Copies of this chain bind each other. A is one copy, B any other.
Amino acid sequence: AYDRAITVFSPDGRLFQVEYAREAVKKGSTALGMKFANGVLLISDKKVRSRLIEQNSIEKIQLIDDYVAAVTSGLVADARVLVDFARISAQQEKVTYGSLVNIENLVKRVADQMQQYTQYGGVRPYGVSLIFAGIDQIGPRLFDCDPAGTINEYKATAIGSGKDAVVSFLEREYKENLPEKEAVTLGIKALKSSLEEGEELKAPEIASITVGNKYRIYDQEEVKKFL
């Protein structure tokens, strides 16, 4: 078979090793983002693993700068290395031009790195998907990115195990330009949609940013009022 090496096309024109890299993404917990009235938000599930782990330790929403955030899903080591790359790439743009004008280009620079590892032998792809959300001179922006290096801009999207349940649910309920407080509810509903059989939804992370402002991370007291 043709699935043993990143540089080998199958006869139908498939890079199987990329597609398998994508299966790594499904093992992550669900996260979603959606655009609303003059703003964008991210929500991410926290599968608590133990009393003994610090909670404000590795949670999944990471600020890239003051106006841009990201959620990841997939191999955690690779997510880390990509977030840190995204952060350095944003600062390079700021040093060259004094401001990040289009976030699409930060994402494009990250996606380029990811694609590069699907064309040369002797490296494996990054087993990660990302969502990028933030404000720029175009407006609020929501993007995703996968192991292949593939970009899409969304109004709402999800990543992780419960992706399909959540994209399926927003496909039916999502409305443009809700207020912040309702978007967040709609998001929480979508997330609840994805669990099986009367299973608990413990406190997720939520972060939001609205035009003219900086990012704000909801603290878990504020987040509870939506459960």
Contacts and interface: CB of A to CB of B under 8 A. Distances in A.
Interface of A: 2-17, 20-27, 50-54, 57-58, 74-78, 80-81, 84, 108, 111-112, 114-115, 117-127, 148-157, 167, 170-171, 174
Given A4-B2, A115-B78, A54 B23 contact: no
13 contacts: A7-B122, A9-B20, A9-B127, A11-B23, A50-B171, A52-B154, A57-B152, A76-B151, A77-B111, A77-B114, A77-B118, A78-B119, A81-B112
Given A108-B80, A122-B121, A155 B27 contact: no
Given A4-B2, A52-B157, A119-B124, A24 B17 contact: no
Given A13-B25, A76-B150, 11 more contacts: A8-B124, A11-B16, A52-B155, A52-B156, A52-B171, A76-B151, A77-B149, A77-B150, A80-B111, A81-B115, A121-B121
B17 A21 contact: no
A31 B200 CA distance: 34
Nearest to A104: B57
A17 B124 CA distance: 12
Contacts of A155: 51-54
A138 to B, nearest CB: 10
Contact of A9 (B2, B8, B125, B152): B125
A21 B77 CA distance: 15
A53 B153 contact: yes
Nearest to A34: B52
Nearest to A24: B13
A185 to B, nearest CB: 18
A147 to B, nearest CB: 9
A16 B114 CA distance: 21
A24 B9 contact: yes
Nearest to A143: B57
A12 to B, nearest CB: 5
A46 B7 CA distance: 29
Contacts of A6: 7, 124
Contact of A152 (B10, B53, B127, B149): B53
Contact of A153 (B7, B58, B76, B81): B58
